[PDB]
Amino acid sequence: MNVLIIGKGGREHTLAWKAAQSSLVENVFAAPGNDGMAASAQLVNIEESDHAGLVSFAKQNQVGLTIVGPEVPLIEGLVDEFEKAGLHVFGPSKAAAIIEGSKQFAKDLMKKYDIPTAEYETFTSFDEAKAYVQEKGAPIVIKADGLAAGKGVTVAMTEEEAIACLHDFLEDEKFGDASASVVIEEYLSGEEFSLMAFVKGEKVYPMVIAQDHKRAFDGDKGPNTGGMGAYSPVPQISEETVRHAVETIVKPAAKAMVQEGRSFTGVLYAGLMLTENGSKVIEFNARFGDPETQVVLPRMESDLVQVLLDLLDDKEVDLRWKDTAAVSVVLASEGYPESYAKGTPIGSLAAETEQVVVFHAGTKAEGGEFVTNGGRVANVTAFDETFEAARDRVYKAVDEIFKPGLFFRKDIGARALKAAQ
Ligand SMILES: Nc1ncnc2c1ncn2[C@@H]1O[C@H](COP(=O)(O)OP(=O)(O)NP(=O)(O)O)[C@@H](O)[C@H]1O
Ligand SMILES: [Mg+2]
Ligand SMILES: [Mg+2]
């Protein structure tokens, strides 16, 4: 079989890396893929945005399973297009991807179906949105309804901050239609963790959970990023917490979507906050997480491709997890998340340390070597039998391949390991 992985980030590298291990698979194609992936995937020069070429390529190249990585094509209905051409494709229809594409939709689903989440309301009027902020006071969380570059969320510590954000989103239409509607919701805290599941209609096959660091700097200080590192398991979260999340959030969410005529197939990603009142949904994503995939997938004992094919063909899914631990650290370009420059030479990015995989997020092969090609550059990912050893191993690996234009957080996983004990 030929498998197509769509996209170009670290999640897709992980996907291609895992698929490559399948006994079922003859070719793994990655469109567009990136140069970090060439050992695991034959790169196919088509953009995740180029839906017609993607569909036409898969159709004509005997691609028996397509796995979609990024959210935008899913949200824009790439799966419908694949299926119109009779291609076998894993991921949600445009109707189902709304659970990520429209935060208001997601909050309303949970309201309707008693799935626990932050108390919220949605607005299209600045005046009414501002009044509600002044009523609730700070802290309060302001979210653009649509994707908004991934920049649509402000956790406001003051009313002024919240109202300025509402100004941007609504009066200035900062993100256009994505911010023509806003969700205003309760600030939560506690342990934040990711619970993904393979889902088809009502069937839910949970994955091991992960946790990430979104803050640029150690001590979780500084601006937000697209993720500075992650790990699975999350030591300080019980198995009971996870199983309860699976039972009262993920499965009910999957059921709800069927009952809404938006039957969901793909990875349902639940971003959860373990509060003093228990898990509450911070967000839903309609696809594999980044950077979570990088520590979750490698823990899979099962063959990803077999799982997906069984799931899609309504067969028994035999999905097994390893006890091992995975921990990854992001190398980002100096300056990210603000301004950064592409082109810095950063070497081979090859580790000697064993049980390490570097998933490339923003690299380009240039002159026998790798240069930086984005803010977050690689996810150095180490596996081991305990959290703490995986933790120690990944930082061996990192120093080894570290280079001038890069930074990274040194404390990935340490608060977790500590709070566990
Ligand atoms: N209700 C809330 N209370 C507290 N923090 C929140 C709340 N909603 C969101 N956040 C925080 O805002 C960040 C989430 O913003 P978001 O854009 O959803 O992040 P993300 O992890 O990049 N999601 P995605 O881009 O889909 O992978 C996290 O640091 C959350 O913990
Ligand atoms: Mg999201
Ligand atoms: Mg079988």
Curated annotation (Swiss-Prot):
The keyword Transcription appears for this protein: no
- Which terms does the record give in the GO molecular function aspect? ATP binding; metal ion binding; phosphoribosylamine-glycine ligase activity
Give the pathway: Purine metabolism; IMP biosynthesis via de novo pathway; N(1)-(5-phospho-D-ribosyl)glycinamide from 5-phospho-alpha-D-ribose 1-diphosphate: step 2/2
Q: Quote the InterPro entries the UniProt record gives.
A: ATP-grasp, ATP_grasp_subdomain_1, PreATP-grasp_dom_sf, PRibGlycinamid_synth_ATP-grasp, PRibGlycinamide_synth, PRibGlycinamide_synth_C-dom, PRibGlycinamide_synth_C_sf, PRibGlycinamide_synth_CS
Q: What is its EC number?
A: 6.3.4.13
Q: Which residues make up the binding site for ATP?
A: 133-194
- Which pairs are disulfide-linked? none
Spell out the SUPFAM superfamilies in the cross-references. Answer: Glutathione synthetase ATP-binding domain-like, PreATP-grasp domain, Rudiment single hybrid motif
Q: Which UniProt keywords apply?
A: ATP-binding, Ligase, Magnesium, Manganese, Metal-binding, Nucleotide-binding, Purine biosynthesis
Co-factor remark: Binds 1 Mg(2+) or Mn(2+) ion per subunit.
Q: Name one GO biological process term.
A: purine nucleobase biosynthetic process
Binding positions for Mg(2+) per the UniProt entry? 283, 285
Cofactor(s) annotated in UniProt:
Mg(2+); Mn(2+)
Q: Where is the ATP-grasp domain?
A: 107-313
Which reaction(s) are listed as its catalytic activity? 5-phospho-beta-D-ribosylamine + glycine + ATP = N(1)-(5-phospho-beta-D-ribosyl)glycinamide + ADP + phosphate + H(+)
Q: What family does the Swiss-Prot or TrEMBL record give for this protein?
A: Belongs to the GARS family.
What's the protein here called?
A: Phosphoribosylamine--glycine ligase
Species classification: Bacteria, Bacillati, Bacillota, Bacilli, Bacillales
